[PDB]
Structure formats: structure tokens, C-alpha cells
């Protein structure tokens, strides 16, 4: 597909595509509504890499997402090749990070750290976890610099975790946003909390 013809393109299931974005943008729009067909890969790539420079513009049309929030994805990756099938849970698979010559492969989860220096005593809970969005419960991270015990598959008296703002005792379920702790800890005894989170 020339970068010269349109700045967009659309829709052939079993037809495979070298992509020129040099002359300008390429905005790809794949077929939609797709019934139960799935089973259908489409192919876009860089024979020559005009990705980077002027990249892809990948547009799924509404409906079934490719992945996540369905907003149009863009690929800086210089070389690239795009294997995407319509996947029966109304989905378009995308091979993560890939090109010729290069194994970029799989995916990188996201750990960030935020230390809580404890003051004032009290401080048996911490709210919103990382300010934006939520904590990811499955891997509990909190430290007194002693690294605190599991929240666990079964919340226990053994597991020392408050979990958000429970009225009395402490809440059996864990919530991402707000956490609580059974301990007042101490000022200067630092509650050091991290997540293993999906998206940043």
C-alpha cells in the first residue's frame, strides 16, 4: 500500500500488506462486525521501515476491540510485522513487540514503588494506593523495612493487613485503591508499599 494513494486504507482479510507511510500517514481500518468468522488474520508490515518516521495508524472500527480501550494503536517500531486474527471473544490479537531481525518478545508488567514515611503514629491505613487508579491485589507489597506478611489467598488474623478502612477489625477483602493495616506501626518506621500493576 503506497503512502501516496490515501493517508488511510481499509479492510481485506486474507490479503497481506507492505506498508509505505513515507509520503504520509497510513490510517488502517479493518473490517468490522465480523459475525462469528474469527479465524481471519490480516497482514501489515514494513518491508522497508517507514514505521518510526511516519508510523502506522491502526484503526479498529468501534465494536470488538483489538485490545483494551480500542483507541487507534500506533507503531514506532522501525521494522515491524503485524499478525492479527479476529479472536472469538470479539477480539483482534496483536503480536506484542516484533519485527524482522529482532525478538522483543512478550510483555513487561509494571512495578512502581512509593515509600510511606510513617508519622503521627495512627496510620493504620493508606488511601488510593498509588494516586492514580488502583493497586493490584494478587502480589501484596508493603514493608516496615521488615517486608510485611502476605495479604494472602485467605485473609487471616495471621496475614497482617488491614485492607481499606474497615469499621472494626479489618476488612477481609483487599481493595486496590485504599489499603489498611492492623498496625499503628510507628513514626519513622516506614510503611513501604509497592505494586505489581498491569498498566502504568
Amino acid at each position: 500500500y503506497n503512502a501516496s494513494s490515501g493517508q488511510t486504507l481499509t479492510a481485506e482479510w486474507g490479503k497481506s500488506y507492505a506498508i509505505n507511510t513515507s509520503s504520509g500517514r497510513v490510517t488502517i481500518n479493518l473490517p468490522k462486525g465480523t459475525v462469528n468468522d474469527y479465524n481471519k488474520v490480516i497482514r501489515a508490515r514494513d518491508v522497508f521501515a517507514t514505521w518510526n518516521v511516519n508510523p502506522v495508524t491502526l484503526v479498529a472500527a468501534s465494536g470488538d476491540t483489538i485490545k483494551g480501550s480500542a483507541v487507534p494503536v500506533e507503531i514506532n517500531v522501525r521494522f515491524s510485522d503485524l499478525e492479527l486474527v479476529y479472536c472469538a471473544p470479539g477480539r483482534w490479537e496483536y503480536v506484542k513487540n516484533k519485527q524482522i531481525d529482532k525478538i522483543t518478545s512478550s510483555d513487561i508488567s509494571n512495578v512502581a514503588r512509593k515509600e510511606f514515611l510513617v508519622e503521627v503514629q495512627g496510620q493504620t491505613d493508606f488511601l488510593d494506593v498509588f494516586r492514580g487508579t488502583s493497586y493490584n491485589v494478587n502480589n501484596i507489597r508493603v514493608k516496615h523495612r521488615g517486608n510485611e506478611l502476605y495479604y494472602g489467598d485467605v485473609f487471616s488474623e495471621n496475614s497482617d493487613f488491614g485492607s481499606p478502612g474497615e469499621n472494626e477489625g479489618e476488612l477481609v477483602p483487599l481493595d486496590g485503591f485504599n489499603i489498611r493495616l492492623r498496625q499503628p506501626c510507628n513514626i519513622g518506621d516506614t510503611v513501604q508499599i509497592e505494586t505489581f500493576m498491569d498498566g502504568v
Partner: protein, 251 residues
């Protein structure tokens, strides 16, 4: 995960040859013969080990002027009119030697992470300033209370203008219907808060409704209103305000 940069930016100032007499410094000072070397390698700008930019959306400017440089792409293209020695088009050398501009005018970005060297050709005045603005994250916009007010606009149906009701009447007896037993209703506003409000204006008391097949009280299929069967074995005929109508004027 790296959270990288979230914008930042770069700008370079070079002066030529001995006029500096000093070598390049960070992204602050650069030095060269300007006519000798087109483009830039950038370690010339300040470098920090995030891979800085979306190479696609790249603000590359010089003087104080916004100008489209990076890649030696342009919507006019004209690599064949890169064409030094003013051989105008067609890529065939005429007059002086034409050659394909691999680097067309302005900047030609390069290979893998970012341009490794942005490859530029144009003349400058020996003191240079080059505006390199490389964004990350995004830009949201924020408005107060006008969304919730302006956005529902097409959503809802508004109350619109409120109406006073000067004409309404009521039955002072609901067994025997009609005059002499009728009572007009004093002025008050209808601002339509719910459907029933709408319902009363469309079916004010004394409204004659007829469903064809439904024997049921209208409030059954409607949901509103106190309804009485009416005019059985009786035709409805326009009552006249001209008393001369012997039947249909006087009651």
C-alpha cells in the same frame, strides 16, 4: 517499566568556526563550519537515556520559526527537486549534476532509536538556535459544570418554558358529570417536573379520550388519570357559543 520523560525538550546554539573558538557544550554550545557540515549528530543536544520522542510527531524548528524539518519528508516531497545546481526536476542531470536527495531539504531523521543523527540541509546565520520540542504523555482539557449542563442537553428533554393555566376546570361532582357542576381553576404555573405534569396538560380534566378496542380504564394502559366512561349511546357534537343553536348551544 520506564516512565521516561513526559515532554522535556532540546535546543542548540552553535556559532561557526573560530567565532566560537570553543567546542560544543552539552546542548548549550555547538561549533562547526556551518556550510561544511549539513545536519547534526545529536549528542549535540542534551542526551539522557530515555529514548526521547515519538519520532512521528517531532517539533524541529530553527530561528523562532515553526518549520517541518525531521526526516526530509515533506508533503511536497521533491527529493528529485532537492536538486542542487538548480536542475529543476526529472532526476536527470542537466546543467550541473543533479542527484537524488536522499536528504531532501531540512532534516532527515535516521535509523533505529530516534534519528541517531537528524540529517539536515539548509543554510543558517552563524549564530544558531534550533527549537527541538519532543513531547511525551498527553494533554487533557478541563471545564467546570458546563459539561454536566451542556452535555445532557441533547440527552434529556428539557422542561422548556413554564405555562400558567388560566382555563382549567374541575368537576364539583364526579357522579353526575358536567355543568352545573364545574369549577374553573385559578392561575398557577405548570413547570413540568415529571411525566404526570406532561400528562395533565395533554389530558386536562374533562378531556374525552377514546381507545378503540380497549375496554379497560385508560389509567390501566396509560398509567395516569381518573377516567370515566362517557357518551354511551351518545354522539359527540360541537357545542355552540351561538345561543341560536337550539340543541347544541344551550345546555
Amino acid at each position: 517499566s520506564q516512565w521516561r520523560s513526559s515532554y522535556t525538550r532540546r535546543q542548540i546554539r552553535l556559532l561557526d568556526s573560530k567565532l566560537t573558538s570553543k567546542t560544543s557544550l552539552e546542548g548549550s554550545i555547538y561549533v562547526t563550519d556551518l556550510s561544511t557540515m549539513k545536519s547534526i549528530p545529536f549528542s549535540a543536544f542534551g542526551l539522557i537515556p530515555g529514548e526521547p520522542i515519538n519520532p512521528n510527531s517531532l517539533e524541529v524548528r530553527f530561528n523562532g520559526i515553526l518549520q517541518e524539518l525531521a526526516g526530509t519528508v515533506g508533503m511536497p516531497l521533491f527529493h528529485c527537486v532537492g536538486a542542487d545546481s538548480d536542475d529543476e526536476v526529472e532526476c536527470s542531470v542537466l546543467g550541473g549534476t543533479w542527484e537524488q536527495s536522499h536528504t531532501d531539504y531540512s532534516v532527515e531523521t535516521d535509523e533505529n532509536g530516534i534519528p541517531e543523527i537528524l540529517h539536515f540541509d539548509s543554510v543558517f546565520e552563524h549564530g544558531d538556535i534550533i527549537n527541538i520540542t519532543w513531547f511525551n504523555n498527553d494533554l487533557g482539557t478541563l471545564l467546570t459544570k458546563d459539561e454536566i449542563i451542556d452535555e445532557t442537553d441533547n440527552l434529556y428533554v428539557s422542561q422548556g418554558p413554564g405555562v400558567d393555566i388560566s382555563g382549567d376546570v374541575n368537576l364539583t361532582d364526579f357522579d353526575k358529570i358536567g355543568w352545573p357542576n364545574v369549577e374553573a381553576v385559578q392561575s398557577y404555573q405548570r413547570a413540568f417536573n415529571a411525566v404526570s405534569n406532561i400528562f395533565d396538560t395533554i389530558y386536562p380534566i374533562g378531556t374525552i379520550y377514546e381507545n378503540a378496542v380497549n375496554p379497560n380504564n385508560p389509567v390501566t394502559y396509560m398509567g395516569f388519570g381518573s377516567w370515566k366512561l362517557f357518551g354511551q349511546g351518545k354522539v359527540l357534537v360541537g357545542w355552540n357559543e351561538d345561543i341560536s343553536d337550539p340543541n347544541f348551544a344551550l345546555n
